[PDB]
Write a protein that binds this ligand. Structure first.
Ligand SMILES: Nc1ncnc2c1ncn2[C@@H]1O[C@H](COP(=O)(O)OP(=O)(O)O)[C@@H](O)[C@H]1O
Ligand SMILES: Nc1ncnc2c1ncn2[C@@H]1O[C@H](COP(=O)(O)OP(=O)(O)O)[C@@H](O)[C@H]1O
Ligand SMILES: [C]/C([C][C]N=N=[N])=[C]\[C]OP([O])([O])=O
Ligand SMILES: [C]/C([C][C]N=N=[N])=[C]\[C]OP([O])([O])=O
Lengths: 244, 256
């Protein structure tokens, strides 16, 4: 019961300012860091520039309103699946058996909720040692035609099915700050996140939901070499932790 | 008025060279589909994106040792990457499509592909985003994992969506009395029925061929829906068949 659920956010695996650009060097290092830690893990990744660009250009997250969005949805779904291959290639190269599980090809959505009615394939892939890799995708919706699922929602489902000991968000920031550290030089790192969120980004809300059953959720900078490796081994690193 | 089409691995890949995609052939076949103007749904095989590694690790035998797991995930990645290449050509010709990997959402039991949840595949077809299934490694309820073929993917979609016509696209003009690559004096079979399938059942067939290929087409047929096996390497032959014209092919009929 010591599995660690990891999200390779789109901020580190892709260049979000450059459409369809894969950060092969960062993902290759992150996969090597994952293997050397010797931990049992499951990998979710974001869509990044392989989806967010065409998404809001056609407002895909708002549902099916025009037939012109159908080729756009297919192109987005083709890109997220292609990105997942590049991620899986790096996992396989390190000796981590993994397979892409596209949510848009397997599940449906209803009122912003990812619905996983059939859990057997994901569970059977896990028991075989072939890590099921979910990711942000365009998903059929029961009310809006289609919708968008995030990497965080995919993790919430896997957090429910497999009860990880730790949950780790890998992004391009040292942690949660008072504001965007890229735009506000007067940003200060927040070390702990509890239900003290009552004072107020909304990432505290996203981190806290996965702290069910006294497990700790971490948010760490993947652009810092070996930080993720040390985190997985239990060594103290710079990060934001959600607890309680 | 939907037509179910299998883009076999023998024509969309170089089956003699691992991980080799025949882009231009697929680009032509997609353009022939667009030019036909038919409501279609496309399944494709794995070809050398699945068979080469499956033979070296006996994946068709199921989970027998831990050395197979890295090979199974390697094939699973290869079939998904090949499917992306196929979808890319479909999108280029104005055919919205999405890859639906059977190993990512289905299981198998006793050599049959179990589809317990039909909603996603049906919702994608309703939106106009063609669900494209393909040959893959699939978790098995009894043997750990199992290999599913394009022919089996075609069966469940035939069961699900009830096409009026089924087309098998391969690297051969049709079914022959023996393998045409190893027998020059072999002739083509024009029509396939349940009667001739029993006529092709031999001891060699049992110990294995042509009987299983006939059975694959016959399972796509019923009282009036026919199955056609056409050569994808013949330019515009798939186009003419989709238009309703007569072409050199093998026809299955009557069901079984
Ligand atoms: N209060 C904040 N603390 C930390 N980062 C923030 C904050 N507000 C905005 N950001 C920005 O959000 C980005 C990460 O969010 P996002 O890219 O959506 O996550 P993901 O990496 O999962 O896609 C960071 O690059 C950071 O610049
Ligand atoms: N009786 C037969 N008739 C036609 N082809 C045969 C026969 N026996 C063996 N073959 C071989 O099978 C090959 C096609 O089979 P396969 O690759 O499974 O089709 P697909 O590519 O549609 O899956 C042909 O290249 C042919 O050489
Ligand atoms: C996929 C998405 C969207 C795009 N397209 N559309 N509607 C998102 C996900 O999320 P992330 O962030 O995790 O990546
Ligand atoms: C997945 C694969 C591999 C295995 N092997 N076997 N029995 C294949 C697919 O299928 P196709 O259709 O391609 O042939």
């Amino acid at each position: 019961s010591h599995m660690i659920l990891i999200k390779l956010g789109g901020s580190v695996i892709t260049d979000k300012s450059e459409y369809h650009k894969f950060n092969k060097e960062t993902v290759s290092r992150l996969a090597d860091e994952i293997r050397r830690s010797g931990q049992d893990v499951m990998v979710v990744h974001g869509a990044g520039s392989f989806g967010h660009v065409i998404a809001k250009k056609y407002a895909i997250q708002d549902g099916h309103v025009d037939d012109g969005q159908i080729p756009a949805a297919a192109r987005i779904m083709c890109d997220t699946r292609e990105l997942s291959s590049m991620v899986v290639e790096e996992l396989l190269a390190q000796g981590i058996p993994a397979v892409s599980v596209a949510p848009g090809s397997c599940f449906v959505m209803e009122d912003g909720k990812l619905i996983v009615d059939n859990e057997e394939p994901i569970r059977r892939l896990a028991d075989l040692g072939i890590m099921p890799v979910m990711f942000g995708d365009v998903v059929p919706d029961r009310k809006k035609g289609f919708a968008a699922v995030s990497g965080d929602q995919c993790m919430e489902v896997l957090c429910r099915m497999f009860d990880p000991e730790k949950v780790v968000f890998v992004s391009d920031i040292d942690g949660l700050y008072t504001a965007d550290p890229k735009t506000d030089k007067k940003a200060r790192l927040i070390g702990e996140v509890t239900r003290k969120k009552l004072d107020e980004h909304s990432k505290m809300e996203a981190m806290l939901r996965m702290t069910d059953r006294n497990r700790r959720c971490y948010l760490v900078n993947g652009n810092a070499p070996n930080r993720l490796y040390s985190l997985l081994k239990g060594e103290t690193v710079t990060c934001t932790v959600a607890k309680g």
